[PDB]
Every structure is written in C-alpha cells, then in structure tokens.
Amino acid sequence: RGIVEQCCTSICSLYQLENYCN
Amino acid sequence: RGIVEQCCTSICSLYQLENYCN
Amino acid sequence: RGIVEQCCTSICSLYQLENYCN
Amino acid sequence: RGIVEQCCTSICSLYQLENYCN
Amino acid sequence: RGIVEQCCTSICSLYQLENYCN
Amino acid sequence: RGIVEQCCTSICSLYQLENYCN
Amino acid sequence: FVNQHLCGSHLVEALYLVCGERGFFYTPKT
Amino acid sequence: FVNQHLCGSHLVEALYLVCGERGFFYTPKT
Amino acid sequence: FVNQHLCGSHLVEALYLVCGERGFFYTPKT
Amino acid sequence: FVNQHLCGSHLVEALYLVCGERGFFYTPKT
Amino acid sequence: FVNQHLCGSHLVEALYLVCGERGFFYTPKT
Amino acid sequence: FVNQHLCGSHLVEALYLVCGERGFFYTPKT
Ligand SMILES: [Zn+2]
Ligand SMILES: [Zn+2]
C-alpha cells in the first residue's frame, strides 16, 4: 500500500522491499 | 524552545536548524 | 533481562552494555 | 551528471544534493 | 574466513553477509 | 588538539572522545 | 531478516543494502 | 525537506549535513 | 568496492534528509 | 552518557563503540 | 585504524538488518 | 573532501552517544 505503509506502517520481508529496487 | 523541543518534540525547517550552526 | 529489555525496553549505562562485549 | 562521481570524491552541499530530488 | 577482510575491501552481498548470522 | 585530526586518522576510544564533551 | 518496521532513514538503508548494484526508488508520499 | 521530527542521532546528523563546514552545537538538556 | 559502497550509504541517507516529500531515485552508473 | 533507550540499529552501534577491539554479541530474541 | 573502524560500523548495521532474530556475533581478527 | 566528511558523520554520531546530557560543540579546524 505504498513503501511506508507496506514497510514502515507495516512489516515487509526481503520480497516486499525487493519490489522497489530498480 | 530548545533544539529538541523545536526539532524533536516539534518540526523545524532548514531555517529552524540553521539557528544552531556555528 | 536480555539486551533489548535491559537497554531498549529500559536504560543501561556504560556498565550495563559492557556486559555484552566479548 | 552522476551521483557517486561528484559527491563521493567531492563533497556535495545540501544544494548540490538537491539536484537529485524528484 | 574473517569479516573485516572480505567485506571491507570487497563488497559483501546480503548473501555473503548472511554467512555471519547465528 | 583538533577533532578530525586524531579521530579520523587514529581511532579515538570512548575516553578520547569524551575529551570533546561539554 | 527484519520482522520489523523500517521507517525514515532506516527504510532507505534497508533498500540500499537489499537492492545493491540495482538501486531503488523512495517515495514517502503514501 | 524533512517536514518531520528529528530526534536523538538523526537530529545531530541533520545538523551535520545542514551546517556543513561551519559546525554546530547540540544541547539535549532542554 | 568499499568506501564507495561506504559513501553511497551516506548519500541516500543525505538524500532522504534533503529530498523528503519529493522523494528520490538512486541510480548508480547511468 | 546516554541516559536513554537504545533500540534496533542504535543499540548495535552503541555496542560497537563501547566494546571497541573486543567485539560484542547481539541477540534480539529476548 | 579508521575507515576500517569506519567500515565496521556499516557491517554490524548491515548484520543487524541481515541477521535479525538469529542475531550475530562480531569477532574482529579471530 | 570525502571519507573525512565521511568520518565526521561518525564522530558527531559517536559524540552524541558519548556526551549525552553534557552535549557537545563540533568545531572543524579551530
Ligand atoms: Zn532511528
Ligand atoms: Zn560511513
């Protein structure tokens, strides 16, 4: 739900942060 | 109201942190 | 009570973190 | 002009850095 | 194989780093 | 005696660092 | 790994490590 | 810029960048 | 290899601070 | 010193400085 | 002496991120 | 120019940790 809502307001694994790599 | 109350307990722009440069 | 409960959930001085040095 | 080039041999000011903001 | 040796002259990937986890 | 001089070529201990506290 | 929230500058450091040579995009708008 | 709270070590890093060659003073007393 | 990966971590940390709302892309080489 | 909570990556940086040449062990389990 | 103490601070910061729950030991030399 | 600006960011981060309540001035050259 956006980088901060997926990772900062929530918890993301390696394969929920890998979504924002170039 | 002090560096932490102006910036940490609050929000300071570039020109509210520039107040503490030498 | 563990490193995080002694230091993160609590407050530890130099001689409560020195407990975890090798 | 590249990032690592003129901020990792030269020191980029807050204004040189700002060339890289969206 | 040492840490500072092959992560501070070479760049250790997330997978090379993971060799050092418990 | 300067900061960057003997903490950025030599490694300053927590006790060498403390020479720079108010 | 990090079963943990990563906010502010800790999120962009996580991206920086994870992504590596690729690079990343940070948009703190929403 | 950073329409955001900067506490602890993130405040002194903000000062460090913003001030540059000048330098800064940090007093976390009040 | 390193101390350029070392410098890059300081960049995206500075760019997070400098850019904020606008956000930023980090594209090595290119 | 730091009459303050040190969590996450700020705890491991505190350990890193304090311990020095010795080294440290971080276990965030409990 | 330094920029190897500089690199080591980036390591345990990366290791905190990489290792998480498992935790880690940091043993220089050895 | 850099990796001395790189080292300086580690200093005020160490000085924040080391000094705490007392606080500190950061005066390059001088
Ligand atoms: Zn933080
Ligand atoms: Zn560094």
Swiss-Prot record, chains G, H, I, J, K, L:
User: From what superkingdom does this record's organism come?
Assistant: Eukaryota
Q: Under what name is this protein listed?
A: Insulin B chain
Q: Please name the source species.
A: Homo sapiens (Human)
Q: What is the lineage of its organism?
A: Eukaryota, Metazoa, Chordata, Craniata, Vertebrata
